[PDB]
Write a protein that binds this DNA or RNA. Structure first.
Ligand SMILES: [K+]
Ligand SMILES: [K+]
Ligand SMILES: [K+]
Ligand SMILES: [K+]
Ligand SMILES: [K+]
Ligand SMILES: [K+]
Ligand SMILES: [K+]
Ligand SMILES: [Mg+2]
Ligand SMILES: [Mg+2]
Ligand SMILES: [Mg+2]
Ligand SMILES: [Mg+2]
Ligand SMILES: [Mg+2]
Ligand SMILES: [Mg+2]
Ligand SMILES: [Mg+2]
Length: 88
RNA sequence: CUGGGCGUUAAGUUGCAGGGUAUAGACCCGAAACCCGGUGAUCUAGCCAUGGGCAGGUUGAAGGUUGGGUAACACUAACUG
């Protein structure tokens, strides 16, 4: 659902460089962008269970990446959740 | 018609008094009712407009705020109401 330009902007904003697409912060930011974007789609299409499964997969993947980041480096995790506006 | 029915050989009429009858309230008193035209919503029934009344003490719906909760809901606790 994210466009190429938006994906590249997120990668540049959260990674070490434009090639840092694999960092945990970049992945979590991309997942957050997709989840927030789909919120509008599921507000209108409440019975789109099949697509909602893919959304819930993004949510669980973000949770697992966040727990890994918190286990590894607490400061990076705190900065990332503050920047993204996530409760945890 | 041999006949048979009704008649012919018995004074009426007009007043006055009286007895009966008729039409009328017709010996007097007495219904429940029926019809016609009026008077009544100062009681009461409903409605309409315009004003008033309801000491004192309780219970604690929805809603709201904050926290928890959720990807977002949902949900949950306290306070408020
Ligand atoms: K005769
Ligand atoms: K006479
Ligand atoms: K008489
Ligand atoms: K009659
Ligand atoms: K009246
Ligand atoms: K009262
Ligand atoms: K309440
Ligand atoms: Mg993907
Ligand atoms: Mg006489
Ligand atoms: Mg007489
Ligand atoms: Mg009759
Ligand atoms: Mg009157
Ligand atoms: Mg009143
Ligand atoms: Mg009172």
């Amino acid at each position: 659902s994210l466009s190429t330009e938006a994906t590249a902007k997120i990668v540049s904003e959260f990674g070490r460089d434009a090639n840092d697409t694999g960092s945990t912060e970049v992945q979590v930011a991309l997942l957050t962008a997709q989840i927030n974007h789909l919120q509008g789609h599921f507000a209108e299409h409440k019975k789109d269970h099949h697509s909602r499964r893919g959304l819930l997969r993004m949510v669980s993947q973000r949770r697992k990446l966040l727990d890994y980041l918190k286990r590894k480096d607490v400061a990076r995790y705190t900065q990332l959740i503050e920047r993204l506006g996530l409760r945890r």
